[PDB]
Amino acid sequence: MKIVYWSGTGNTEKMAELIAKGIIESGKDVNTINVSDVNIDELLNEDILILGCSAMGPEVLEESEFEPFIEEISTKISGKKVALFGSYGWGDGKWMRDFEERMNGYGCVVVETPLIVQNEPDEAEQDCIEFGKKIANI
Numbered sequence: 001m002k003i004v005y006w007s008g009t010g011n012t013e014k015m016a017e018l019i020a021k022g023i024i025e026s027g028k029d030v031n032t033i034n035v036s037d038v039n040i041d042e043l044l045n046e047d048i049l050i051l052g053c054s055a056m057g058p059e060v061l062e063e064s065e066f067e068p069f070i071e072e073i074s075t076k077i078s079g080k081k082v083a084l085f086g087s088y089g090w091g092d093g094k095w096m097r098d099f100e101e102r103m104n105g106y107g108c109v110v111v112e113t114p115l116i117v118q119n120e121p122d123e124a125e126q127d128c129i130e131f132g133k134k135i136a137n138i
C-alpha cells in the first residue's frame, strides 16, 4: 500500500509513520511517500489511496504542493477508496470536512472517518496505529 502526505513541521509525517506501523502490524507492506516524491501513475494503481495533509490557512490544504497534486489526480480517481488524515492546530477540522466533501465530490469512496489530531500525535499515537489497522482490513 502507499501513504502520501505533506507535513510542514513533522506532525502529519509522524501520523503517517504510525498509520504505516498499523498496516505493517496487520501483516501488510506499505510505503510512506512525501507528496513531492510521488509518482501519479504508480499511485493510481493502488486499491486505496491514503492521503494526509495538515491544516494550512485559512482552513485549506497546503497550497504549493499538496493541493496541485489533488487537482491533478481529481479526474482519475472516481470509484477509488480513500482514507484521509492530518494534523491541525487551532481550528476544529474545517479543512478536513472540506477535504472529505471534495474527495466525495470527485467520486471517491471515503472508507473511514478522517483521522485528525491536534498538533503532534504523542497522546494519540495508538489512534493512528488503529486507523492503519482499519485500513488494512478493507
Ligand SMILES: Cc1cc2nc3c(=O)[nH]c(=O)nc-3n(C[C@H](O)[C@H](O)[C@H](O)COP(=O)(O)O)c2cc1C
Residues within 6 Å of the ligand: 006, 007, 008, 009, 010, 011, 012, 013, 053, 054, 055, 056, 057, 058, 059, 060, 087, 088, 089, 090, 091, 092, 093, 118, 119, 120
Ligand atoms: C501558515 C499556517 C497556517 C495554519 N492554518 C491553520 C488553520 O487554518 N487551522 C488550524 O487548525 N491549524 C492551522 N495551522 C496549524 C497547523 O495545522 C498545525 O501546526 C499542524 O500541527 C501542522 O502539522 P504539520 O507539521 O504536519 O504541518 C496553520 C499552520 C501554519 C504554519
